[PDB]
Design a protein around this ligand. Structure first.
Ligand SMILES: CCCCCCCCCCCCCCCC(=O)O
Ligand SMILES: [Pr+3]
Length: 230
């Protein structure tokens, strides 16, 4: 699609419209960083690991009726990469696609004396999400609320409307620090006041077909509509 000709409600510019450029806010030494096959696989592995663990009713959270295995989406990743070139986490850009009408988005920021390897940047993001298990509750799962501490990152990873993810990464130097912005776009968003995922008495009880690897999740062909909410 030509993103310049894909409108969105609110009429904001689309992150994918026009030629890519680094924002002035990146300072003068930014570098977008390629997430190779190994990195993409690791991101997927950790997201599917947590989904599978939650789906069987872990952490005092409910059993999930129809939580799908997530795949990597190149288009979402390309848009996430473009976003990182701005060196700013939250913006008002549109980021819709023809397949995914309201993609969710997570932004992981790093600042430190030294720049960690790409793998360490991913590990740090995973750690942040994992530690939110102490913040999330059965209540949040039944009725999504984002502020209360943080749960946005972990909660999006375990949304049963989510079907795909794609991330990007830019690193730079400013304020006497190495900095990074790792952005992950998801096929869907959690919806305020609606369940993060639907409960079942048994994991994947409402899957047409369960996955063989992630035994508590639906397989990759599960016809979950990412543009519908709970
Ligand atoms: C790049 C980050 C992706 C989005 C954030 C990832 C969400 C947290 C992932 C936690 C995975 C580890 C938990 C798996 C369950 C377990 O082994 O106990
Ligand atoms: Pr490549």
């Amino acid at each position: 699609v030509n993103y310049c000709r894909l409108p969105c409600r609110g009429d904001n510019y689309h992150v994918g419209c026009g030629e890519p450029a680094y924002a002035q806010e990146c300072g003068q030494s930014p570098r977008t960083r390629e997430l190779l096959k190994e990195h993409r696989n690791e991101i997927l592995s950790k997201i599917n690991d947590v989904r599978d663990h939650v789906a069987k009713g872990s952490w005092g959270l409910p059993v999930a009726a129809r939580m799908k295995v997530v795949v990597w989406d190149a288009e979402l990743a390309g848009l996430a990469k473009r976003h990182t070139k701005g060196c700013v986490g939250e913006t008002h850009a549109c980021r819709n696609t023809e397949r995914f009408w309201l993609p969710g988005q997570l932004n992981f920021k790093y600042s430190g004396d030294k720049l960690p390897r790409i793998k360490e940047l991913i590990d740090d993001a995973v750690k942040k999400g994992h530690l939110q298990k102490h913040n999330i509750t059965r209540e949040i799962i039944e009725n999504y609320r984002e502020n209360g501490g943080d749960v946005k990152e972990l909660a999006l990873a375990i949304s049963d409307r989510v079907t795909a993810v794609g991330c990007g990464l830019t690193t730079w130097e400013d304020g006497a620090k190495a900095r990074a912005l790792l952005t992950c776009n998801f096929s869907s968003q959690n919806t305020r006041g609606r369940p993060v995922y639907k409960i079942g008495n048994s994991p994947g009880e409402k899957c047409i077909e369960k996955d063989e690897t992630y035994k508590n999740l639906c397989s990759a062909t599960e016809p979950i509509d990412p543009n519908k909410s709970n």
